[PDB]
């Protein structure tokens, strides 16, 4: 679903960008927007907690990935689909996929690869919506994400 993709892209890319810069983007978003703003707000709350709770694991995975350049960022999808497609599907695992994206985005700013944050956000959005389309539709997309963590 291109609507699920374009909404997910805006939520993920906004969170990854603002985690990297340290500054939040202004309130107006694209289509839907009201649901997306609520989703970004719950994502900041839950996602910041996940980064703190899994700091050692995130540090370990970052080291393993050994990200140095733009080519390393594109080779990521291979591990991303491996780890994320095996096992159960729930909102906690979706938050973990996104929060680790934020953790990687901060590292990219550090190594002067900030231009890779958008392609990375795009890659996460694509893997998420492509592999979990039906489950996301059943949960009423980003409306169900907000409700679940309410
Ligand atoms: O779901 C889980 O078990 C799990 N465990 C982890 C333990 C550590 C770090 C993440 C995870 C996850 C998230 C899914 C897989 O994420 C990824 C894997 C690889 C590269 C990535 C790059 C950008 C964003 C997500 C990535």
Q: What is the DSSP string of 72-128?
A: HHHHTHHHHHHHHHSS---HHHHHHHHHHHHHHHHHHHHTT-GGGHHHHHHHHHHHH
Q: Is the CB of 76 under 6 A from ligand 1?
A: yes
Q: How far apart are the first and last CA of the chain?
A: 25
Residue 16 CB contacts under 8 Å (≥ 6 apart), including other chains: 101, 102, 105, 117, 120, 121, 124
* Tokens encoding 3: 């609507």
For the CA of 98, the nearest atom of ligand 1: 24
Q: Select from 36, 59, 40, 37 the least CA-distant residue to 48.
A: 40
Whether 92 lines ligand 1, by a CB cut-off of 6 Å, is no
How many C-alpha atoms does 131 have within 13 Å on its Cβ side? 21
Contact by Cβ (8 Å): 51, 99 = yes
Is the Cβ atom of 62 under 6 angstroms away from ligand 1?
Answer: no
Residues 6+ apart with CB under 8 A from 4: 129, 133, 136, 137, 141
CA distance 95 to 115: 23
Q: How far is the CA of 71 from the centre of ligand 1 (A)?
A: 18
From residue 8, how far is each of 17, 52, 55, 108 by CA, in Å? 14, 23, 25, 21
Taking alpha carbons only, the member of 15, 1, 8 closest to residue 32 is: 8
List the one residue out of 48, 3, 15 whose CA is nearest residue 149. Answer: 48
The token pair at 51 is 């980064």
Residue 32: φ, ψ to 5° = 80, -75
CA distance 77 to 90: 20
- Which residue, by CA, sits nearest to atom 20 of ligand 1? 80
How far does the centroid of ligand 1 lie from the alpha carbon of residue 18, in Å? 20
Q: In angstroms, rounded to a whole number, what is the distance separating the alpha carbons of residues 52 and 33?
A: 28
80 lines ligand 1 (CB under 6 A): yes
Domains of the chain: 1-149 (1.10.437.10)
Query: Cα–Cα distance between 150 and 14 in angstroms, integer?
Result: 21
Provide the 10 A C-beta neighbour count for residue 105.
26
Is the shortest distance between the CB of 121 and ligand 1 below 6 Å?
no
Structure resolution, Å: 2.2
Give the integer Cα–Cα distance in Å for 86 and 73.
Answer: 21
């Amino acid at each position: 679903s291109m609507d699920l993709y374009r909404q997910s892209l805006e939520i993920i890319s906004r969170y990854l960008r603002e985690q990297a810069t340290g500054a939040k983007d202004t309130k107006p978003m694209g289509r839907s927007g009201a649901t997306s703003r609520k989703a970004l707000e719950t994502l900041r709350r839950v996602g910041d907690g996940v980064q703190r709770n899994h700091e050692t694991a995130f540090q370990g995975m970052l080291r393993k990935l050994d990200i140095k350049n733009e080519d390393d960022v594109k080779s990521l999808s291979r591990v991303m689909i491996h780890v994320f497609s095996d096992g159960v599907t729930n909102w906690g695992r979706i938050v973990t996929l996104i929060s680790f994206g934020a953790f990687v985005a901060k590292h990219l700013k550090t190594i002067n690869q900030e231009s890779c944050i958008e392609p990375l956000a795009e890659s996460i959005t694509d893997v998420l919506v492509r592999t979990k389309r039906d489950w996301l539709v059943k949960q009423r997309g980003w409306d169900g994400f907000v409700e679940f963590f309410h």
